[PDB]
Amino acid sequence: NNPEFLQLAEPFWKELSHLPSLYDYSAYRRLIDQYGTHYLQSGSLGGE
Amino acid sequence: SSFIRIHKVMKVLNFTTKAKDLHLSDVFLKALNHLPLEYNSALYSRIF
Amino acid sequence: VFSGDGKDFYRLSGNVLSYTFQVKINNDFNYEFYNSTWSYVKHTSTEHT
Amino acid sequence: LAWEKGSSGLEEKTFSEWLESVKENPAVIDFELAPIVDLVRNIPCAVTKRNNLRKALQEYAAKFDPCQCAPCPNNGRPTLSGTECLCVCQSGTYGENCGQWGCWSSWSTCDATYKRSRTRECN
Amino acid sequence: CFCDHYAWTQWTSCSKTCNSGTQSRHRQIVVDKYYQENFCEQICSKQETRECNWQRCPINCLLGDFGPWSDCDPCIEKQSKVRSCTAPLVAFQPCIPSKLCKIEEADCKNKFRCDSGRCIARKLECNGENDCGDNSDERDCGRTKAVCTRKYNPIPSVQLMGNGFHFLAGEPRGEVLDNSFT
Amino acid sequence: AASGTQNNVLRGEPFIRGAGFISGLSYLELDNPAGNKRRYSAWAESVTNLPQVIKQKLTPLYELVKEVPCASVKKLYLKWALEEYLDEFDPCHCRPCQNGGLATVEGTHCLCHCKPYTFGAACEQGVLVGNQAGGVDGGWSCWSSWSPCVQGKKTRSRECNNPPPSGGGRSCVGETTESTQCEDEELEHLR
């Protein structure tokens, strides 16, 4: 279930809290690089 | 030259859900309580 | 969650909405076989006396 | 069995093992349906949010319909999942993208009587 | 005969982009002595045709402009904004609620209230079975009545009998009904 | 005079993705093209006993910002940062690769991921076997300057560019222009 109070991870929540209030692309770039661009919505675990 | 194909289906055990007094799950009833009182198509489409 | 294609029992979570035990698998086979051959023979003879 | 399919020759040895495996774990094939709005019955305010859910389902069906998706090559049934339309391939068809009802019409003006109509086309 | 003496030409361009394509190649046949003196005409294929880009032409996912802001009276100050792809379908933002949460009450009247929110009958309490889902009913039961003599295994593939079905998506849904409650 | 030339350039690169049982079917390659049946069943069981997380569906990551200090402001700024990240290293900047190669951006360097049965600097050598229809497909150009928010709409208007459809392939699929509602500090940042 995507819409809920999903328990965030310690590093993810910590980095999101350490983000500055004012728009700063520096930390935003590093967080996007470390954590990615998208999260899981649906999909099986089919092999290949 | 040749080519053959087959298809088969299995009629394995039935399933019959009880008509009334069905016991809902934890996460469903939890999400079903966060719904707004006033009508809101957007937030209602989420649980859909 | 009961035993599905695994051990005796697993444990789900509140954040996870579903665990499913339906089996589906796809396969493919595209075999190709070629073999060419060449055989040319030429002979000539000329004798004059 | 899926791996042995490369040399099938109408094999039947592993068929019994596959039958046993399906007996151990089947998959949903056929089923009857019923509206999910009838499942919310034991909440504090049942009727209110039940009618709200019925209205939400009506508006969602008005928003998303299988007719919106493009047709399929060979009698396929297109399904809408998110923002993409996938064709359900029937027996005898393959590929990544493999009569059907059309889109509903707009709700006519509410007449003097209760009677209000909506029409779908089998095109 | 040696049909490979006249090598196949390169496959031509696909006849159409996405709908349906046709491409063909032909033998580079020259009428020499080897061709006529070996009956190479009647036995060697002179063309090979195959399809290309057999998929469909899916239209581009086209969304619409946003609609007017919707008034909010929920217990959580969030407002909806719906529009008709990679952009989100509906994006919700914090709202300015003219009225906060209300109509708060206890759902259970003649039954037991589990701390997780589930409302089960009081008969299901102190029976040696987790009925609330978080072992709330059997928290501090001094004595329990054995409802089943021996621990039995559950039905296989029983969770698939509780999942919801989204008719539009072709993949039924996540879990909605509980199949562990007895 | 007798002259003879022999050349047997046979190669392979299986993609088998169970951690331990990977080596078996992949190393069975020597003189055994077809994989063993029992080894295949063992690998199937192993890959059942260990996940294969690939083949996913995605959703915007910035939506997970729900209950944090300065939640909505950080969410909007992460939206802007994700847009800037997406359009800063979009592979559109990279030049088109030969033989239908696919280009990527790793930092500040373009890498032409070669199609199967190809290699080289820009996927130019190794044209022995194509096994496809052929041609040169189309590629979308880089997004132009963003709209000045006259009425909220967008004016990126992605158009064709230096890699046009020439070898008879299909054009680049996608919209021509985009349109949305400009933020303008998101209605002065939510009232």
Ligand SMILES: *[C@@H]1O[C@H](CO)[C@@H](O[C@@H]2O[C@H](CO)[C@@H](O)[C@H](O)[C@H]2NC(C)=O)[C@H](O)[C@H]1NC(C)=O
């Ligand atoms: C190459 O040509 C041969 C024809 O001689 C094809 O298969 C042969 O089949 C006979 C049948 O008894 C075997 O004795 C030979 O050993 C086979 N050839 C070889 C090279 O083993 C074969 O399919 C053709 N194509 C290839 C080898 O790729």
